């Protein structure tokens, strides 16, 4: 199907939750004519709603803490849809207040999952893959949204910068 | 302790690998005057030399195989230290064959380590991680065990036919 039959549900998703918590959202859809297996359109809205929702809650700041920080005073979410290859890859962008990085490692260490010497050299790919360990931020977990992934044999990434913003991407294989 | 007591000794040992092996190979080394705590230059050594001899022998092609493939017939290998905040990254590059993706994940199913289904969206990272896998191809396992004895970190990037990049990062400590 294309991935429309998903994405059309969003914009009322999207505009509710942004309702709910108050928050000033611009959301923008691209590639939604990208078309996929049955199964994966059938599977694929629960985790993109999982990841739009923690965008709007934790990534997206409210209007006037985006103009106290210099930034555009609304913030904008975008969920798009692409070839690459056999694969479809599928990103949802947020220019919020990014993931705190610093606030990882301590939540690692404070679970006993590493120590402070060797949390000085991780990689950021290393720290932001603490988000995916079951219970991690136990409020989407992003274990919960790699599992269902993981079930469509597809990979989920996270990158993030603090105040800049999170963007998730997740390939999925033709099957 | 500057990290030169241990790159000047590397000079000899790339010439001498790579005529063995007849490779015609520019070794470039930067960022010798680095300075990191003296445990971490002494132990770093071996490793390092494990990965020259990588290069050499796996990654820069002989001169015929390059002079066919259209690349200089020089090969390059740059070994290169320097500060990234209160860390220290060490660098050994190479333009040669690069690392077979693919056949890295060829292996990994023969092995039994994953299934072919999952093989199709796997991330570039996580298909050059099993090469720190004992008994995956003085190994790369060791070299990854030495580093996190050291409380570092190491990465392999690559892309056929271009060329291969190690990372090693250090606590300064
Ligand atoms: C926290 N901060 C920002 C975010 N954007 C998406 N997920 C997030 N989690
Ligand atoms: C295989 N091919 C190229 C290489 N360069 C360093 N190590 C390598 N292994």
Do not use: C, Y
Not at 20 to 49: A, C, Q, S, W, Y
Not at 65 to 71: D, P, Q, S, V, Y
Not at 76 to 81: G, P, V, W, Y
């Amino acid at each position: 199907v294309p991935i429309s039959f998903v994405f059309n549900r969003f914009p009322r998703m999207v505009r509710d939750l942004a309702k709910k918590m108050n928050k000033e959202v611009n959301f923008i859809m691209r590639g939604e004519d990208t078309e996929l297996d049955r199964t994966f359109v059938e599977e694929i809205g629960e985790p993109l709603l999982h990841l739009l929702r923690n965008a709007i809650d934790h990534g997206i700041e409210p209007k006037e803490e985006r103009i106290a920080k210099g930034k555009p005073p609304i913030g904008t979410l975008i969920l798009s849809a692409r070839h690459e290859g056999n694969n479809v890859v599928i990103e949802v962008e947020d220019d919020g207040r990014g993931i705190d990085k610093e606030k990882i490692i301590r939540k690692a260490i404070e679970k006993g999952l590493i120590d402070e010497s060797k949390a000085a050299t991780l990689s950021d790919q290393e720290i932001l893959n603490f988000l995916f360990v079951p219970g991690f931020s136990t409020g989407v977990g992003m274990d919960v949204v790699k599992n269902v992934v993981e079930s469509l044999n597809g990979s989920i990434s996270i990158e993030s910068e603090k105040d800049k913003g999170t963007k998730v991407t997740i390939r999925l294989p033709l099957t």
